[PDB]
A = this chain, B = another copy of it.
Amino acid sequence: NKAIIHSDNAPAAIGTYSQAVKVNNTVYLSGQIPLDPVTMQLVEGDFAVQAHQVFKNLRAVCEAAGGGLRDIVKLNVYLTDLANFPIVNEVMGQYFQAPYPARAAIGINQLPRASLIEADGIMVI
């Protein structure tokens, strides 16, 4: 049972990808960056503001997929500077409650739109 997920409260998938794909109860989430889905530009603000937007964006995809952030089982967090990770960890506390998803945090070189953070993952409802 395969389905493309789209939410108009998450940035439009421009190009050869979908916001997420759902097969039975498992949902594969595309990477989200701090795009404001309205302006299609990065939200303005410090790292924390960008992290907030990434999770708001994922939340909308999760909701469009029939669940919420609580259904995320694995989260990949890509940062241009790992020094920012404690902020990610703390912001996550506002969007997730125990039990938390598995997680991998990696310091990488570049992200789309010069973002400071991109996160993707897997959800199971």
Known contacts A92-B16, A93-B16: A106-B108 contact under CB 8 Å: yes
Q: How far is the CB of A83 from chain B (nearest CB, A)?
A: 9
A105 is an interface residue with CB less than 8 A from chain B: yes
Contact with B along A103-125 (1 / 0, CB 8 A): 11111111110000010101010
Nearest to A4 among chain B residues (CB) is B99
B residues near A74, Cβ cutoff 8 Å:
21, 28, 30, 122
CB within 8 Å of B: which A31-56 residues: 31
Set B28, B103, B108: member contacting A107, Cβ < 8 A: B108
Asked whether B25 lies within 8 Å of A102 as measured between CB atoms, the reply is: no
Known contacts A4-B99, A100-B16: A106-B118 contact under CB 8 Å: yes
